[PDB]
C-alpha cells in the first residue's frame, strides 16, 4: 500500500471494519504500520482487531478440517486441504509477528504500547502452537510464553490491576497455560489472582472504566467456572 497516505489507510481500515471486510482491514493496517511511524492507541486496536478476525476465521476452519481428518483416521484430500488452510494461517501469523519485530516492539517505550504488542506476540505464537507438532511445537510454545511473561512483568510494574490490557493479557496467558502448556493449575491460579486483584481496585474507577474492567473480569470468571 506504499502509494496510499497513512491517514487514508487508517480511514479505510475503519470503513473495512464497518463493512466486515477484515482481510482488507488487515491489509490497510499492515500498510499503515509499514509507513514506519508509531501507532496510537486507537490505531493499535485497529491492527489487532483486523488480524484477530482474519486469523480467527482461519483457526475455526482449521479446527473443522482437523476434526474431519481425525475422524477419517479412526484419499489425500482432507489432509491436503487442512494443510492448505494451515499454511495460510501460519503465513498470517508470520506476517503479524514480522510487523511486531520490524519495528513496532522496539520503538514502543511506553508501557501501554509495549505491553499491547508483547501480548499480540504471545497470541500469534500461541496460534502457531495450536497447529504445530513435535519439537518445533516446543520452541514455538516457549516463544509464546516468553512474550507473555515479558508483557506480564511490565504490566504488573506499570499498570493498575484493572487496566483492560493488563486484564486481557492475563486472560490470554491463562488460556495459554490451560490449552497449550498443559498447566491447568497455573491457568486457574493466574485467572483467580488476576480477578481478585482487579476486584479490589474497582473502587478507584469511574463508571465507564468500571464497565471496561468488569467486562473482562467476567471472562476470567467464565473460564474459572469451566475449569473448576
Amino acid at each position: 500500500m506504499g502509494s496510499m497516505e497513512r491517514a487514508s489507510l487508517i480511514q479505510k481500515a475503519k470503513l473495512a471494519e464497518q463493512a466486515e471486510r477484515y482481510e482488507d482491514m488487515a491489509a490497510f493496517m499492515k500498510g499503515a504500520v509499514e509507513k514506519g511511524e508509531e501507532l496510537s492507541c486507537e490505531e493499535r486496536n485497529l491492527l489487532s482487531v483486523a488480524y484477530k478476525n482474519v486469523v480467527g476465521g482461519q483457526r475455526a476452519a482449521w479446527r473443522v478440517l482437523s476434526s474431519i481428518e481425525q475422524k477419517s483416521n479412526e484419499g489425500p484430500e482432507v489432509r491436503e486441504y487442512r494443510e492448505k488452510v494451515e499454511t495460510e494461517l501460519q503465513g498470517v501469523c508470520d506476517t503479524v509477528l514480522g510487523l511486531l519485530d520490524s519495528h513496532l516492539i522496539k520503538e514502543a517505550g511506553d508501557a501501554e504500547s509495549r505491553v499491547f504488542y508483547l501480548k499480540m506476540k504471545g497470541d500469534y505464537y500461541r496460534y502457531l502452537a495450536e497447529v504445530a507438532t513435535g519439537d518445533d511445537k516446543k520452541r514455538i510454545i516457549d516463544s509464546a510464553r516468553s512474550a507473555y511473561q515479558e508483557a506480564m512483568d511490565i504490566s504488573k510494574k506499570e499498570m493498575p490491576p484493572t487496566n483492560p490490557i493488563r486484564l486481557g493479557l492475563a486472560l490470554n496467558f491463562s488460556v495459554f497455560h490451560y490449552e497449550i502448556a498443559n498447566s491447568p493449575e497455573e491457568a486457574i491460579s493466574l485467572a483467580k489472582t488476576t480477578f481478585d486483584e482487579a476486584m479490589a481496585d474497582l473502587h478507584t474507577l469511574s463508571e465507564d472504566s468500571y464497565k471496561d474492567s468488569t467486562l473482562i473480569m467476567q471472562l476470567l470468571r467464565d473460564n474459572l467456572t469451566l475449569w473448576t
Binding site: K14, E17, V49, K52, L171, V175, E179, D222, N223, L226
Partner: peptide, 9 residues
C-alpha cells in the same frame, strides 16, 4: 476456555 474475543474495535 475463552480468550479475549478481540474482534470489534
Amino acid at each position: 476456555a475463552g480468550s479475549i474475543p478481540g474482534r470489534r474495535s
